[PDB]
Design a protein around this ligand. Structure first.
Ligand SMILES: */C=C\C(=O)N(Cc1nc2ccccc2s1)C1CC1
Ligand SMILES: */C=C\C(=O)N(Cc1nc2ccccc2s1)C1CC1
Lengths: 305, 300
């Protein structure tokens, strides 16, 4: 038993990370088939990033302006292109380590694993969630640009995130792998704030079910509530509304414990009243909202890849 | 910026995970060169888990009593032997994916990554710490025995933990890769219980420094302490004594932030007395003790 925040094994993705340098900027690239993906702002100068004209910045560059380095082997670039905010670099040779993969775009409240890299060499791996305000609370230092997020289904890697920038609030912003930003963000050095975060309600309830599956029962109670009554108290504590589809998805965990979702909502309702104040659940003094229902089930049932 | 519990990239260990079957029991093994390592209790039957004599069980075994699978491939065992609590299966093929590696024995407070596996197949990776009572607070369903913990430095994998057992209290015990248990535990299913656990004080201080490095100072105060008066207070909160060696270990983080170690000790002293008062540190509403001083500089 036990319950930790668990990242997907990262080996399928480790073999796809390369170093991409365009004139004194260096960040990370994703090498799949014969194409290397990376943030388009790698073509920006430290003076062009205030208000970049990306059409004109790319039309000036040609293939020789990009050095791609896979470990210590140089990759010769034979074509360059832009799709939304990602730069596509076509290379001489295809990646022999290319996994079965698929570009997907995730909803807020879904989790994924991030392979943090620096100069194209993977450094660490962690589990994070796409926040309702479309940021992630990651760990990224200078030169982590281009690190990707992903999930694994059987043997297929779903790439869902590429890291572009840090917001002044410390949180991070990026795109899917087709270059579309998550959230209302642009790739410029301009003041950009995110909306007020809210809490992913359905993940909080799923984590509470993982608590009772591990013996933590002191927060339970008998009084049920209505969906309308709960959504009103969720409104006041900046919790996301709980939809009827969230209750259905929580169906499995409601069975495995015999606690109705709306019973758990009163447990969560009362926990939102005067709090925990040092009282803990699964070793946490706050309510954790970065575990999906599928995460709770895949860890309380041992699915591998 | 940002500070997260971060595991090492698991790719170099994924290539070493195999499945070891003996009689009716299947667990994970570690295929390095032409040797496979697994917990020795793989040779136990149902009447063999209270008081097994492992020497007697192993002498009755032929090579073909051990089935080893690496994916679809069946590896042929050409010899077996035992080192403390680890069984070593010599196979006819050296693992082509064997990384540069070392076996190391860690000390309480040290962190490592766990590659949880089921049936030789890697399921997930996470960071955890060797607790002062020599257990780990892992995530380990049945049939995850033989999952290993590790660190990676440059491109050399230091293996430090093999999982063997879950204890009545829900926490986990295992050995180094020479088969010697961490703590006073034996691979028998007779009643065993971990000693009382304590917070890893030197790790909490490193995490406070990491909070200052990431831009939070609200928990500092104007006070200092002596090493002795800190230890007298901390132990009333179930905290590990802070030795002189620990404060030397925190010297680099101290120089980087400009805050003396004993001043941060006064800070921790007050946090234990007051709580957070509705605030959080690096995303947490309690004091975090599974980040070493080395973990902190690698992530900041
Ligand atoms: C990922 C490392 C990093 O922070 N930088 C700094 C930059 N931030 C932005 C934001 C918007 C557009 C362009 C850039 S560059 C990097 C060198 C890559
Ligand atoms: C690998 C699964 C696991 O940990 N267990 C618990 C066991 N403890 C011991 C102790 C001594 C000898 C053998 C075993 S197995 C089991 C499913 C059985």
């Amino acid at each position: 038993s036990g319950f930790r925040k668990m990242a997907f094994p990262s080996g399928k993705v480790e073999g796809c990370m390369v170093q991409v340098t365009c004139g004194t900027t260096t960040l990370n690239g994703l090498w799949l088939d014969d194409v290397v993906y990376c943030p388009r702002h790698v073509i920006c100068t430290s003076e062009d990033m205030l208000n970049p004209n990306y059409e004109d910045l790319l039309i000036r560059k040609s293939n020789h302006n990009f050095l791609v380095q896979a470990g210590n082997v140089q990759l010769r670039v034979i074509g360059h292109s832009m799709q939304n905010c990602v730069l596509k670099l076509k290379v001489d040779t295809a990646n022999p380590k290319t996994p079965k993969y698929k570009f997907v775009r995730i909803q807020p409240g879904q989790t994924f694993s991030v392979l943090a890299c620096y100069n194209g060499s993977p450094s660490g791996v962690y589990q994070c969630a796409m926040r309702p305000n479309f940021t992630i609370k990651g760990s990224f230092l200078n030169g982590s640009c281009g690190s990707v997020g992903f999930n694994i289904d059987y043997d297929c890697v779903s790439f869902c995130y590429m890291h572009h920038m840090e917001l002044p609030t410390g949180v991070h912003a990026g795109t899917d792998l087709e270059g579309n930003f998550y959230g209302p963000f642009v790739d410029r050095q301009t003041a950009q704030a995110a909306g007020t975060d809210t809490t992913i309600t359905v993940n909080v309830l799923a984590w509470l079910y993982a608590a009772v599956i591990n013996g933590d029962r002191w927060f339970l109670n008998r009084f049920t509530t209505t969906l309308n009554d709960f959504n009103l108290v969720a409104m006041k504590y900046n919790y996301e509304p709980l939809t009827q589809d969230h209750v259905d998805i929580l169906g499995p965990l409601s069975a495995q414990t015999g606690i109705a979702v709306l019973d758990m909502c009163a447990s969560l309702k009362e926990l939102l009243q005067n709090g925990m104040n040092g009282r803990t659940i699964l070793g946490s003094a706050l309510l954790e909202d970065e575990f999906t229902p599928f995460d709770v089930v895949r860890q309380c049932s041992g699915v591998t890849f």
